[PDB]
Amino acid sequence: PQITLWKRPLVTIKIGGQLKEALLDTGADDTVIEEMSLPGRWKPIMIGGIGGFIKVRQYDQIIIEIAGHKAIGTVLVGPTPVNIIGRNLMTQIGATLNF
Amino acid sequence: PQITLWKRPLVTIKIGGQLKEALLDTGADDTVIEEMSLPGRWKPIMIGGIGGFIKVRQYDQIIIEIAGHKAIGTVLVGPTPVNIIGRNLMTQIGATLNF
Numbered sequence A, B: 001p002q003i004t005l006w007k008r009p010l011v012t013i014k015i016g017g018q019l020k021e022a023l024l025d026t027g028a029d030d031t032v033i034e035e036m037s038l039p040g041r042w043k044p045i046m047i048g049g050i051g052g053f054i055k056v057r058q059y060d061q062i063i064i065e066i067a068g069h070k071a072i073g074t075v076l077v078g079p080t081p082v083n084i085i086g087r088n089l090m091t092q093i094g095a096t097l098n099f
């Protein structure tokens, strides 16, 4: 599919057994999902954005489906205001920018 | 061109006749450039991302070239960690996401 940028490029994702809406963010290196009770071990890390840093839990090898496309990778979980899909998973679904 | 996402989608821009490197960010509503002298009138506003809110200068109807493509629109100037090109100008150059 092709997604224009008139509006925020929101897509449905599946993670942790839950469907959610998330933002395809080419300016995000990583994937950050709003606070959810993901099972298993994780690692404390900090990530930064326009107005500073926030604390997140880093989970490896997390299965996620993005707009119907299967992926698996590192997912960060924490108090983000928007669920964000970053390059680490956008590359796995073959997404490009085109102009 | 078509741009993959294994690395950050960094491009050269020209603003106020000065060359800069900036990130194409589909997760940004707006365009935010690091502090610089820029010809034109501005108004103070707040923008937010991961980490919180910051203060920026809003300039409208600014001529800006992005990877050799022309845009004329709103440019926010302030303490951003990196130069970011958002949807307001990416739509002007015909950028889409594709997968």
Ligand SMILES: CCCC[C@H](NC(=O)[C@H](C)NC(=O)[C@H](CCC(=O)O)NC(=O)[C@H](Cc1ccccc1)NC[C@H](CC(C)C)NC(=O)[C@@H](NC(=O)[C@@H](N)CCCNC(N)=[NH2+])C(C)C)C(N)=O
Residues within 6 Å of the ligand: A023, A025, A027, A028, A029, A030, A031, A032, A045, A046, A047, A048, A049, A050, A058, A081, A082, A084, A086, B023, B025, B027, B028, B029, B030, B031, B032, B047, B048, B049, B050, B081, B082, B084, B086
């Ligand atoms: C496991 C590795 C962790 C390492 C870690 N890495 C990072 O912190 C990296 C650089 N961060 C990033 O790449 C983060 C995303 C988080 C992430 O992927 O980790 N990217 C970002 O935050 C990039 C800008 C950026 C790029 C590069 C460097 C720094 C900043 N912007 C993405 C961001 C998404 C939005 C939905 C919150 N967009 C914005 O911030 C734009 N804001 C807007 O569009 C607002 N109008 C929307 C507001 C939403 N609501 C609200 N706030 N209440 C702004 C740029 C005009 C580190 N410590 O450096």
